[PDB]
């Protein structure tokens, strides 16, 4: 393995990856990433990036790994490799409480919908909704989405369910918002949970993350770390 593993994360997706008041990285990805590094007996440099720059950065070797609620998708498996699943991640719409909005083309035609640049939600939204005349708006970071949502510049936003809920709906910014309809299940766009994104040729590094991850799951470090943030089964199936 490298002496120092450089891990890219988008620090705008609480409670997975965000900054505290003094600019330190916090959230479940950071705790997963630090624990794994600990067991791998390597050093880990955290690197902040816009989400859409992480895969490009990994391919260019500016970073060695991505831990950024990165969904394991068939599209992304063409370009990069992944650890074993870190946690599940479903997609779900939010709008102003008592919006009639549903994640359907019929509900959203006319409306302004925020999605993260580079995300699965952007892929789903662009193909299903933007083509069909929904005003789908793509943002550098999820904080700009929540801000344009509370500004009234966006009718709704699509992102990871658990990010919206712990990161927005249950924080002071989101008290006037709710989920708009149920989660959107779609195998092709949304992938099979999140993992560490790695260069396809880094077989050793993948082997090292996968070994650390099973180890922390066998001894209950995982549920202990998860209970900090979640009162449910974040790992999923
Ligand atoms: N740290 C972040 N900003 N994560 C964005 C995740 C959105 C979605 N899971 C995807 O893989 O596209």
In angstroms, the Cα distances linking 115 to 5, 42, 118, 186 are: 30, 35, 9, 16
Q: Which of 7, 18, 68, 144 to mutate to test the pocket of ligand 1 (most atoms within 8 A of CB)?
A: 68
Q: Whose structure tokens read 């050793």? A: 204
- Reduced to 3 states (helix: H, G, I; strand: E, B; else coil), residue 4 is strand
CATH of domain 90-190: 3.40.190.10
User: Looking at domain 1-89+191-237, which CATH architecture does it have?
Assistant: 3-Layer(aba) Sandwich (3.40)
Pocket flag, ligand 1, residue 13 (CB < 6 Å)? yes
The C-alpha R_g of the chain, in whole angstroms, comes to: 18
Q: How far apart are CA 127 and CA 115, in angstroms?
A: 13
Start-end ranges of CATH 3.40.190.10 in the chain? 1-89+191-237, 90-190
Annotated resolution, angstroms: 1.6
Handedness of CA 213, 71, 179, 138 (dihedral sign): positive
With residues binned 3-state (H G I as helix, E B as strand, rest as coil), the percentages for the chain, rounded to 5, are: 40, 20, 40
Q: Does 119 sit in the ligand 1 pocket, CB within 6 Å?
A: yes
């Amino acid at each position: 393995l490298p002496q120092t593993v450089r891990i890219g994360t988008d620090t705008t997706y609480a409670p997975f990856s965000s900054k505290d008041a003094k600019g330190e990285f916090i959230g479940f990805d950071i705790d997963l990433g630090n624990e794994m590094c600990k067991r791998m007996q390597v050093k880990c440099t955290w690197v902040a990036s816009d989400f859409d720059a992480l895969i490009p950065s990994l391919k260019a070797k500016k970073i060695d790994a991505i831990i950024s609620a990165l969904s394991i998708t068939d599209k992304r498996q063409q370009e990069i490799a992944f650890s074993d699943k870190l946690y599940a991640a479903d997609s779900r719409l939010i709008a102003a409480k008592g919006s009639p909005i549903q994640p359907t083309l019929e509900s959203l035609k006319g409306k302004h919908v925020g999605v993260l640049q580079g995300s699965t939600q952007e892929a789903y939204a662009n193909d299903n909704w933007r083509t069909k005349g929904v005003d789908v708006v793509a943002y550098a970071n999820q904080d700009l989405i929540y801000s344009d949502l509370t500004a009234g510049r966006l009718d709704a936003a699509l992102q990871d369910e658990v990010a919206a809920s712990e990161g927005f709906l249950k924080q002071p910014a989101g008290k006037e918002y709710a989920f708009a309809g149920p989660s959107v299940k779609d195998k092709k766009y949304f992938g099979d949970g999140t993992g560490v994104g790695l260069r396809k040729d880094d077989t050793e590094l993948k082997a090292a993350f996968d070994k650390a991850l099973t180890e922390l799951r066998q001894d209950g470090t995982y549920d202990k770390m998860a209970k900090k943030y979640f009162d449910f089964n974040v790992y999923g199936d």
